[PDB]
């Protein structure tokens, strides 16, 4: 499940979590270039342990 | 169990402290230890021998698989024990001995079962888990035998003698396992200790054909998870121990080049103890190439397997070690090459350019002679760049590491003006910490300052002769002829016997030497001899050299004031200096002749033998 979301995150950029099965979460912004600085931030509790934190930052 | 949980509680924090990307290690739940069924072993006298025999052989067959029978009953589990068993006093004496022959294997089984389901806990590391798993496979066959024996016993084909007869291999196997289990538990054994212990319990039997399979199997099984950690360290160069069991440890804390990877004696297996240092060196060498760029992995076959009575596990590591050292050496000799980095230190410190100095001494003789506190650091660096552009060291690409460092003295243990306090500071790159060192930089600086003082006095002594000729006395003519023709010859000796021969041999060490721990030693030896064969780290320094140089600087100071507007006062102080100088020159020749190579510098200093003492 997680890997399917992860292959729609690096190929479509959609979280595909409904109960936080993925680490990235989305805050609705004003959508005038404040997407980049506020919208996606890491949740460090749902990063899979076989995935390293460096990769988790990079896929964002 | 109780006593093992303490060991786990220590080692979990020990391994957690190192980790910064992992998480806390899960332990087995509480219920698993609690049950006495998920862990290992927790008128009648008048009847004939056959009924008593059938009953006792069934109960004994029961206690083999870890459940109590009727007559024999395992005494209750509490802590670590070697188990003791009761028997009823209703049995005949023949049966009472014949049971007691068998009870060793039951007591051994009890220990092995507790060992297997305890040392599968996570803190012990992967090798101990694999030891428990191989013992688990061995425990499995015993149940097969017991289950066949019940079918035999129903048909009237089991008694104590037959049972004992059948279990003759199994009792010996279980006994050797019991020795290993108690030696691994009682003190702390994790990593290479419980891998060496099985390599030396394979030399307590030099041949059986039963124990051979057992020890070879347990070693080969337990060495695979150690090899898992090992093969990422020798071929790739990263440790990645998920549990600290490996021989080389990394604790994070420029210089982190052999200080980040240390060694722990227990974690080394005995069959790799001879190669332990080489196994440490490989990953250290391949680590340093990764940070500049391009991770390299060895194309070499990565299959290494433990063999009893063969050392086939040697040659793969040997080839990998050779390839590894070659890759670091080749990487350096093609980019970040040694014959530029060392060659520029030679070019300025050891003065392969004397054109980088002939401008600089003439240009900055006034502004160096001021006191060291008076002189500001930027002025030196700027004037240095002027003389760098006048010199042809400008066309050398490495001239960008000429800096300022002011230093107190080089006549302290084994100056006060800008000259002889002045030094350069060389800065090197990351993989040049394994050759070029901080201690080596410190020792190079003093060498330059020594030669710098000797060049300063040469400038003074030539100035006196050229000014003194006007288009008074000849007493200072011969004194100056004995000073200049002293200091020039110390340069001729100190260079053309120590420096250039050994440097040209060191270029033959940088074609024929296949690793880095040769080159490091060769370099250190050249520096240590280029100090020790001179007056630098001589134990009493030969202090007469500093005294003679002091008489030189006083003489040239007085001789520059040859201009009148008393000739006798100058003549008297020059002769006082002449006594002070000639005595110390003879004292130098004597003090060096007694000290332990002499005849070369003595014949250089005097050849006629006008003075011979």
Helix content of chain A: 25-40%
Name the shape of chain B in a single word. Answer: rod-shaped
Give the radius of gyration of chain B.
40 Å
H and E order of chain B: HHHEEHHHHHHHEEHHHHHEHEHHHHHH
> Strand arrangement, largest sheet of chain B?
1-2
DSSP strand (E) fraction of chain B?
Answer: under 5%
Structural overview:
The PDB classes it as cytosolic protein. The entry lists the keywords Assembly, Intermediate, Complex, cytosolic protein. The entry is titled "Structure of recombinant human gamma-Tubulin Ring Complex without actin". This is part of a larger assembly, with chains A (60 residues) and B (613 residues). Chain A is an alpha+beta fold and 60 residues long. Chain A has helices at residues 2-6, 35-38, 53-59; strands spanning 25-26, 40-41. Chain A has a two-stranded antiparallel ribbon. Chain A is globular, with a radius of gyration of 12 Å. The relative contact order of chain B is 0.05. Chain B has 613 residues and is mainly alpha-helical. Chain B has 22 helices and 6 strands. In chain B, helix 17 runs antiparallel to helix 18, helix 17 runs parallel beside helix 19 and helix 18 (475-509) runs antiparallel to helix 22. In chain B, the strands form 3 sheets. Chain B has a two-stranded antiparallel sheet with strand order 1-2. Chain B has a two-stranded antiparallel ribbon with strand order 3-4. Chain B has a two-stranded antiparallel sheet with strand order 5-6. Chain B has helices at residues 2-18, 30-34, 49-64, 93-100, 103-116, 126-154, 160-166, 168-186, 193-200, 211-236, 276-292, 315-334, 338-348, 355-369, 377-390, 418-421, 438-468, 475-509, 516-532, 544-560, 567-594, 598-605; strands spanning 73-74, 85-86, 248-250, 261-263, 405-406, 422-423. The A-B interface holds A 49, 52-53 and B 21-23.
List keywords for this structure.
part of a larger assembly; 2 chains; A: 60 residues; alpha+beta; two-stranded antiparallel ribbon; B: 613 residues; mainly alpha; 22 helices; 6 strands; 2% strand; cytosolic protein; Assembly; Intermediate
């Amino acid at each position: 499940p997680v890997l399917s979301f992860l292959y729609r995150w690096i190929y479509d950029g959609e979280l595909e979590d409904t109960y936080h099965e993925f680490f990235v979460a989305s805050d609705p912004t004003v959508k005038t270039d404040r997407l980049w600085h506020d919208k996606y931030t890491l949740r460090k509790s749902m990063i899979p342990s076989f995935m390293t934190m460096d990769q988790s930052r990079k896929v964002l | 169990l109780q006593q093992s949980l303490e060991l786990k509680r220590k080692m979990l924090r020990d391994k957690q402290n190192k980790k910064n990307s992992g998480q806390h290690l899960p332990i087995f739940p509480a219920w698993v230890y609690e049950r006495p069924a998920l862990i290992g072993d927790f008128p009648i006298g008048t009847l004939p021998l056959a009924s008593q025999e059938s009953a006792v052989v069934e109960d004994l067959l029961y206690v083999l698989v870890g459940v109590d029978g009727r007559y024999v009953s395992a005494q209750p589990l509490a802590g670590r024990q070697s188990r003791t068993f009761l028997v009823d006093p209703n049995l005949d004496l023949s049966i009472r001995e014949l049971v007691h022959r068998i009870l060793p294997v039951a007591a051994s089984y009890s220990a092995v079962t507790r060992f297997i389901e305890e040392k599968s806990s996570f803190e012990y590391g992967q090798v101990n888990h694999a030891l428990a798993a191989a013992m688990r496979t061995l425990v499995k066959e015993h149940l097969i035998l017991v289950s066949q024996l019940e079918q035999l016993h129903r048909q009237g084909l089991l008694s104590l003698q037959k049972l004992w007869f059948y279990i003759q291999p199994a009792m010996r196997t279980m006994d050797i396992l019991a020795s290993l289990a108690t030696s691994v538990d009682k003190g702390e054994c994790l990593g290479g200790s419980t891998l060496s212990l099985l390599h030396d319990r394979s030399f307590s039997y030099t041949g059986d054909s039963q124990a051979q399979e057992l020890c070879l199997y347990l070693t080969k099984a337990a060495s695979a998870p150690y090899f898992e950690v090992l093969e990422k360290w020798i071929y790739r160069g990263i440790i990645h121990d998920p549990y600290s069991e490996f021989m080389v440890e990394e604790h994070e804390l420029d210089k982190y080049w052999d200080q980040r990877y240390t060694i722990v004696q227990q974690q080394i297996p005995s069959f790799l103890q001879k190669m332990a240092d080489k196994i440490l060196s490989t990953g250290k060498y391949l680590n340093v190439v990764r940070e500049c760029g391009h991770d390299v992995t060895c194309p070499v076959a990565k299959e290494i397997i433990y063999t009893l009575k063969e050392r086939a596990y040697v040659e793969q590591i040997e080839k990998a070690f050779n390839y590894a050292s070659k890759v670091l050496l080749d990487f350096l000799m093609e980019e970040k090459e040694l014959v530029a980095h060392l060659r520029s230190i030679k070019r300025y410190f050891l003065m392969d350019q004397g054109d980088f100095f002939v401008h600089f001494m003439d240009l900055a003789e006034e502004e160096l002679r001021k006191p060291v506190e008076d002189i500001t650091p930027p002025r030196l660096e700027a004037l240095l760049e002027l003389a760098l552009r006048m010199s042809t060291a400008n066309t050398d690409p490495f001239k960008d590491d000429l800096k300022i460092d002011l230093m107190p003295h080089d006549l302290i243990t084994q100056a006060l003006s800008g000259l002889e306090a002045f030094s350069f500071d060389y800065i090197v790159k990351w993989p040049l910490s394994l050759i070029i060192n901080r201690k080596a930089l410190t020792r190079y600086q003093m060498l330059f300052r020594h030669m710098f003082y000797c060049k300063h006095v040469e400038r003074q002594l030539c100035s006196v002769w050229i000014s003194n000729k006007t288009a008074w006395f000849a007493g200072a003519f011969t004194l100056r002829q004995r000073m200049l023709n002293f200091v020039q010859n110390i340069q001729y000796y100190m260079m053309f016997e120590v420096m250039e021969p050994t440097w040209h041999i060191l270029e033959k060490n940088l074609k024929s030497a296949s690793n880095i721990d040769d080159v490091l030693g060769h370099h250190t030896g050249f520096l240590d001899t280029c100090l020790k064969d001179c007056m630098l780290t001589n134990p009493e320094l030969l202090k007469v050299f500093s005294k003679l140089m002091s008489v030189c600087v006083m003489f040239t100071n007085c001789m520059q004031k040859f201009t009148q507007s008393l000739v006798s006062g100058f003549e008297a102080t020059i002769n006082k200096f002449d006594k002070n100088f000639s005595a110390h020159l003879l004292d130098l020749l004597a003090r060096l002749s007694i000290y332990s190579g002499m005849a070369s510098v003595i014949s250089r200093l005097d050849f006629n033998g006008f003075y011979t003492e």
